[PDB]
């Protein structure tokens, strides 16, 4: 239905050990499909999903060239902002960007993003109208002034409204069999005695995709989210995700509790009991 493409750039300086290192990864929804590392023996954009490998040599050459340009651009960035703030020569610094687009079920642009951060906090971002910049502070206003005088916003808006959307739809088509096919969670309940009086019921959801999922316990048919222990949704390493929720309950009362799971890959909510 609704989809997105996202790139994540990070450049990290290391004063005294050569130029800053630049790294990039690309995503369609929750699947990584490309990466770049400036430190690599031979720096190339590399595929990370089957459905882009088929892209021809011209595609890879271009991505690699832009990635090389980008790493130089960010090295200038780091050095320039260093000056704006007059930081010390010894410390390392980071410069981040994430950009991309969301499209609705009709395949039209829902919205575009292009946000930069310096040392882990907002620096400058392209506004939702894609025609103005929001600067987080004084240093950023300088950057903003330059981007305005060069009219870069227009270039960014063109990529996001055009290229970004067009290529997302293309990847979505080429990868439809994995990307447009939600994988239902395999769910189960484990049983862990704490004392003779208390036991832990833990509800697991395994091997699901996309990452978005709902998980919760009820007693006698209604909520008890307070007293619910969760973990953050985590990657299994094979492109699928994991999550569990747990509650400590009285011995001999396990049968009162139900676990409930909602996920795009299930037609209908699931309920489990011990």
């Amino acid at each position: 239905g609704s989809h997105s493409m996202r790139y994540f750039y990070t450049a990290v300086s290391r004063p005294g050990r050569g130029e800053p290192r630049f790294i990039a990864v690309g995503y369609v929804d929750d699947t990584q499909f490309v990466r770049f590392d400036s430190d690599a023996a031979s720096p190339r954009m590399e595929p990370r999903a089957p459905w882009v490998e088929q892209e021809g040599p011209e595609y890879w050459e271009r991505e690699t060239r832009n990635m090389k340009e980008a790493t130089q651009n960010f090295r200038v960035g780091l050095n320039t902002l260093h000056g704006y703030y007059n930081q010390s020569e010894a410390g390392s610094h980071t410069l981040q960007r994430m950009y991309g687009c969301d499209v609705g079920p009709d395949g039209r642009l829902l919205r575009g993003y292009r946000q930069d951060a310096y040392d882990g906090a907002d620096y400058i971002a392209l506004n939702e109208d894609l025609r103005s910049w929001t600067a987080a502070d004084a240093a950023a206003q300088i950057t903003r002034r330059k981007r305005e005088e060069a009219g870069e916003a227009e270039q960014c808006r063109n990529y996001l409204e055009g290229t970004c959307v067009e290529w997302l739809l293309r990847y979505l088509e080429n990868g439809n069999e994995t990307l447009q096919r939600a994988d239902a969670p395999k769910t189960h309940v484990t049983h862990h005695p704490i004392s003779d009086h208390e036991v832990t019921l833990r509800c697991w959801a395994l091997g699901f995709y996309p990452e978005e999922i709902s998980l919760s316990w009820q007693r006698d048919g209604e909520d008890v989210t307070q007293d619910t222990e969760f973990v953050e949704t985590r990657p299994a390493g094979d492109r699928t995700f994991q999550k569990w929720a747990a509650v400590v309950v009285p011995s001999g009362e396990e049968q009162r509790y139900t676990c409930h799971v909602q996920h795009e890959g299930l037609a209908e909510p699931v309920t489990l009991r011990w």
Partner: peptide, 12 residues
């Protein structure tokens, strides 16, 4: 497909 950033390093 990534954006092209060529020759905009003076924008910082």
């Amino acid at each position: 497909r990534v954006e092209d950033v060529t020759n905009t390093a003076e924008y910082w």
